[PDB]
């Protein structure tokens, strides 16, 4: 639900889209 | 062989006087009204009364 919505685009520095960490999406882009 | 004398600004245009282009004949489609180049299907695929291609 919320984590699916927050995994779309919003590419993190060292990563790409698609394989966004299932648990780590709240540190850099907080 | 190369020109020993430079060509003025009048002879160049005299030669170019025959380089003009001609406007191609256009017609109106009988199903949508837009002007289309003669003897050809409009953008809607309607040539005369024959459905030729799918709409654009």
């Amino acid at each position: 639900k919320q984590t699916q919505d927050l995994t779309k685009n919003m590419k993190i520095k060292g990563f790409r889209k698609g394989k966004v960490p299932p648990t780590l999406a709240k540190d850099y882009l907080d | 062989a190369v020109q020993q004398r430079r060509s003025s600004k009048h002879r160049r245009d005299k030669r170019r006087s025959h380089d003009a282009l001609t406007a191609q004949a256009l017609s109106v489609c009988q199903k949508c009204g837009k002007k289309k180049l003669f003897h050809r299907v409009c953008s809607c695929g309607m040539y005369g009364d024959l459905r030729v291609k799918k709409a654009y």
Partner: protein, 95 residues
Amino acid sequence: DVTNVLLKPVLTEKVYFNQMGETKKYVFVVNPKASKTRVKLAFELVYGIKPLKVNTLIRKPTTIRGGSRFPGLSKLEKLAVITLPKGIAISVTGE
């Protein structure tokens, strides 16, 4: 000993691929003049668990921002791949 030879951890797809699946592999960036033994000693004095093995990478500097009004070169990095034993997983942040 002084522990200035452990500069910085890095998290990429390769890093997260290793940091999962039984044996964990943690990749840091270290002092380019440091040796493998120094890397093991620094991890000893700051973490406490003996590494199973250490691998080192040298990435040469290259031109960046080419064509930009002022072009610039990269920075020399030495990468170190620590691997802790089976079943142990310590946190890089939080001590």
